[PDB]
Amino acid sequence: HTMVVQAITFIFKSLGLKCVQFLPQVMPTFLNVIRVCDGAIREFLFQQLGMLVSFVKSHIRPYMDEIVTLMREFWVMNTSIQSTIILLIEQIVVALGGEFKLYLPQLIPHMLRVFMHDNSPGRIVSIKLLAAIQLFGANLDDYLHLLLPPIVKLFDAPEAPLPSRKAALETVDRLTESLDFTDYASRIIHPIVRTLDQSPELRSTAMDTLSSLVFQLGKKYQIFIPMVNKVLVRHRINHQRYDVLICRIVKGYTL
């Protein structure tokens, strides 16, 4: 098992994009091997499929539907296979890019179950899945209303550990750069204000997330300025970028 799979990968890496020729031979067999493989080999095959997909890139579209079905069947609460599949998700997202939004709805049910019940020590499987969601990019447009509540519950939960809370906040920061967040202004700003009370450690990260959100909302943020200012004074939060952005919004200058 191991020897055969490794050789095929090294061949494709050394060839480059000329390996696309061999796709119709390799893929159907390789997928049927993942189906009937057992135990440890499964994890290794999914790792090597990730490499394959990273090399094939856009050309993997015909076989993508089967791969998702495979993932859907073999996703389990086993910590090991979850980290593996999340890595395989990150490689499918960079490979397909814009075409990933066709397949994302199949994966969403499993991602929402990961947040609901993650028993991972320090929720490191959650942090990994956040790092993946960052790659999803403008694919998340039609599904942001589904993904965002779990992320918001993640960084507002006090029981949850600080690393996993920073990971959620940094994710919302990144997604603000690419997605539209006007719809979900209240759903985020109110947990943030609440986070700036319940924990002084996240105050820095949260304020950076807030400023980014402010930059994206613009004049639509005007409503919240009284309420957020009240929370800032209560703990003397004096952020350079944020105070600049507010000052610009009230003035009305656009930049």
Partner: protein, 48 residues
């Protein structure tokens, strides 16, 4: 009210000038029937 004329504001609505696109250059490096070496096009690719 005072018997006084209202000061006319600086009406800047007028267009400074009207441009006219006199001619158009369609440089087409289509290279029909040949594929650029840099990009390895997929078999279906985009034909239209």
């Amino acid at each position: 009210e005072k018997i006084e004329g209202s000061k006319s504001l600086a009406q800047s609505w007028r267009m400074k000038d009207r441009m006219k696109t006199v001619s158009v250059a369609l440089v087409l490096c289509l290279n029909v029937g040949v594929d650029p070496p840099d990009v390895v096009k997929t078999t279906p690719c985009a034909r239209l």
